Design a protein around this motif. Structure first.
Motif, PDB file in Angstrom:
ATOM      1  N   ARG A   8       0.838  -1.194   0.000  1.00  0.00           N
ATOM      2  CA  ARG A   8       0.000   0.000   0.000  1.00  0.00           C
ATOM      3  C   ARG A   8       0.876   1.248   0.000  1.00  0.00           C
ATOM      4  O   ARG A   8       1.846   1.317   0.751  1.00  0.00           O
ATOM      5  CB  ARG A   8      -0.914  -0.002   1.225  1.00  0.00           C
ATOM      6  N   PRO A   9       0.556   2.234  -0.856  1.00  0.00           N
ATOM      7  CA  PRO A   9       1.309   3.484  -0.845  1.00  0.00           C
ATOM      8  C   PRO A   9       0.972   4.360   0.362  1.00  0.00           C
ATOM      9  O   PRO A   9       0.352   5.417   0.220  1.00  0.00           O
ATOM     10  CB  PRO A   9       0.900   4.138  -2.165  1.00  0.00           C
ATOM     11  N   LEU A  23      -3.045   7.004   2.761  1.00  0.00           N
ATOM     12  CA  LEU A  23      -2.901   6.211   1.550  1.00  0.00           C
ATOM     13  C   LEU A  23      -2.984   7.117   0.333  1.00  0.00           C
ATOM     14  O   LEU A  23      -3.976   7.829   0.156  1.00  0.00           O
ATOM     15  CB  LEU A  23      -4.027   5.176   1.489  1.00  0.00           C
ATOM     16  N   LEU A  24      -1.946   7.085  -0.501  1.00  0.00           N
ATOM     17  CA  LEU A  24      -1.968   7.779  -1.782  1.00  0.00           C
ATOM     18  C   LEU A  24      -2.923   7.049  -2.725  1.00  0.00           C
ATOM     19  O   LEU A  24      -2.671   5.919  -3.141  1.00  0.00           O
ATOM     20  CB  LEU A  24      -0.567   7.880  -2.391  1.00  0.00           C
ATOM     21  N   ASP A  25      -4.023   7.717  -3.058  1.00  0.00           N
ATOM     22  CA  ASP A  25      -5.197   7.048  -3.598  1.00  0.00           C
ATOM     23  C   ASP A  25      -5.668   7.725  -4.887  1.00  0.00           C
ATOM     24  O   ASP A  25      -6.464   8.670  -4.867  1.00  0.00           O
ATOM     25  CB  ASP A  25      -6.294   7.049  -2.528  1.00  0.00           C
ATOM     26  N   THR A  26      -5.180   7.219  -6.013  1.00  0.00           N
ATOM     27  CA  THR A  26      -5.486   7.803  -7.313  1.00  0.00           C
ATOM     28  C   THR A  26      -6.939   7.601  -7.755  1.00  0.00           C
ATOM     29  O   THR A  26      -7.432   8.325  -8.623  1.00  0.00           O
ATOM     30  CB  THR A  26      -4.525   7.279  -8.395  1.00  0.00           C
ATOM     31  N   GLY A  27      -7.629   6.647  -7.137  1.00  0.00           N
ATOM     32  CA  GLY A  27      -9.050   6.439  -7.393  1.00  0.00           C
ATOM     33  C   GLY A  27      -9.976   7.320  -6.571  1.00  0.00           C
ATOM     34  O   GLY A  27     -11.194   7.260  -6.734  1.00  0.00           O
ATOM     35  N   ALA A  28      -9.413   8.118  -5.668  1.00  0.00           N
ATOM     36  CA  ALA A  28     -10.199   9.063  -4.881  1.00  0.00           C
ATOM     37  C   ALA A  28     -10.111  10.458  -5.494  1.00  0.00           C
ATOM     38  O   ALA A  28      -9.014  10.975  -5.691  1.00  0.00           O
ATOM     39  CB  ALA A  28      -9.705   9.087  -3.440  1.00  0.00           C
ATOM     40  N   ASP A  29     -11.261  11.052  -5.809  1.00  0.00           N
ATOM     41  CA  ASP A  29     -11.311  12.446  -6.257  1.00  0.00           C
ATOM     42  C   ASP A  29     -10.863  13.359  -5.130  1.00  0.00           C
ATOM     43  O   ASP A  29     -10.222  14.381  -5.356  1.00  0.00           O
ATOM     44  CB  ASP A  29     -12.733  12.883  -6.618  1.00  0.00           C
ATOM     45  N   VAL A  32      -9.908  12.356   2.214  1.00  0.00           N
ATOM     46  CA  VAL A  32     -10.793  12.050   3.337  1.00  0.00           C
ATOM     47  C   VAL A  32      -9.975  11.496   4.496  1.00  0.00           C
ATOM     48  O   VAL A  32      -9.279  10.489   4.355  1.00  0.00           O
ATOM     49  CB  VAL A  32     -11.882  11.020   2.955  1.00  0.00           C
ATOM     50  N   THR A  80     -14.035   7.223   7.249  1.00  0.00           N
ATOM     51  CA  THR A  80     -13.366   6.512   6.165  1.00  0.00           C
ATOM     52  C   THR A  80     -12.586   5.339   6.763  1.00  0.00           C
ATOM     53  O   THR A  80     -12.065   5.442   7.877  1.00  0.00           O
ATOM     54  CB  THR A  80     -12.466   7.473   5.343  1.00  0.00           C
ATOM     55  N   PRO A  81     -12.533   4.201   6.050  1.00  0.00           N
ATOM     56  CA  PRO A  81     -11.795   3.045   6.566  1.00  0.00           C
ATOM     57  C   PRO A  81     -10.300   3.312   6.756  1.00  0.00           C
ATOM     58  O   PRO A  81      -9.649   2.647   7.566  1.00  0.00           O
ATOM     59  CB  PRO A  81     -12.018   1.968   5.497  1.00  0.00           C
ATOM     60  N   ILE A  84      -7.215   8.780   3.288  1.00  0.00           N
ATOM     61  CA  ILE A  84      -6.894   8.733   1.866  1.00  0.00           C
ATOM     62  C   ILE A  84      -6.572  10.125   1.331  1.00  0.00           C
ATOM     63  O   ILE A  84      -7.331  11.076   1.532  1.00  0.00           O
ATOM     64  CB  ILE A  84      -8.005   8.062   1.013  1.00  0.00           C
ATOM     65  N   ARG A  87      -7.001  13.002  -5.385  1.00  0.00           N
ATOM     66  CA  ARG A  87      -6.412  13.741  -6.496  1.00  0.00           C
ATOM     67  C   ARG A  87      -6.362  15.254  -6.268  1.00  0.00           C
ATOM     68  O   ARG A  87      -5.482  15.925  -6.795  1.00  0.00           O
ATOM     69  CB  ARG A  87      -7.143  13.407  -7.803  1.00  0.00           C
TER      70      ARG A  87
END
Ligand SMILES: CC(C)CN(C[C@@H](O)[C@H](Cc1ccccc1)NC(=O)O[C@H]1CO[C@H]2OCC[C@H]21)S(=O)(=O)c1ccc(N)cc1
Lengths: 99, 99
Positions: A8-9, A23-29, A32, A80-81, A84, A87
């Protein structure tokens, strides 16, 4: 940094003098974070993800330091779990996906 | 290629005869796709995001083509609102985060 994805990043962030893992999360706009107190006014909002919608508090123009890179932007706080980084902030540190 | 994060990192994936649009998602452990009838054995699984958990079917060793790159691994199938390419497949195309 270049960060690979076998794990996990997860990176350490600084926000309000607090150190947190996120978490670096490219699927999150959007960015959070788990329940925390931040100063200033906030707006109640709702956002949807994989399992449906949650209520968050929207804080704007919040300084965050991500791996020593300084951003200033919107932070949503709620159940949030995991923390995150979305972007809205990944763009501010100049983050890209490369292959 | 280099993909910026101003917009959602959507790319075209191929799996069997089906073309799909999916998110290059460093925040996702495993790949999860919308409704599709894959061949072979699967195991039930629950995965959690914002808002709680959804039930999916785990299909292993599924060939996937992502941006012209042939890859092979686990594909989860269930009611995700968006198709997601997870770390399990991003590593196989040598995808990194860079800033
Ligand atoms: C919540 C994350 C820790 C993990 N997820 C990936 C994550 O990138 C999702 C991926 C995602 C993307 C769109 C819709 C649902 C889920 N993004 C997300 O929830 O972002 C939210 C914050 O900003 C908003 O922008 C998009 C949704 C909001 S997840 O969808 O729940 C998920 C969890 C487990 C797996 N295997 C695959 C995906």
């Amino acid at each position: 940094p270049q960060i690979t994805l076998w794990k996990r990043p997860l990176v350490t962030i600084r926000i309000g003098g607090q150190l947190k893992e996120a978490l670096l999360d490219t699927g999150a706009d959007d960015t959070v974070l788990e329940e925390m107190n931040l100063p200033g006014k906030w707006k109640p909002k709702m956002i949807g993800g994989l399992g449906g919608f949650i209520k968050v508090r929207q804080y704007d123009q919040i300084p965050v330091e991500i791996c020593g890179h300084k951003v200033i932007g919107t932070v949503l706080v709620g159940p949030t779990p995991v923390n995150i980084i979305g972007r809205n902030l990944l763009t501010q540190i100049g983050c890209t996906l490369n292959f």
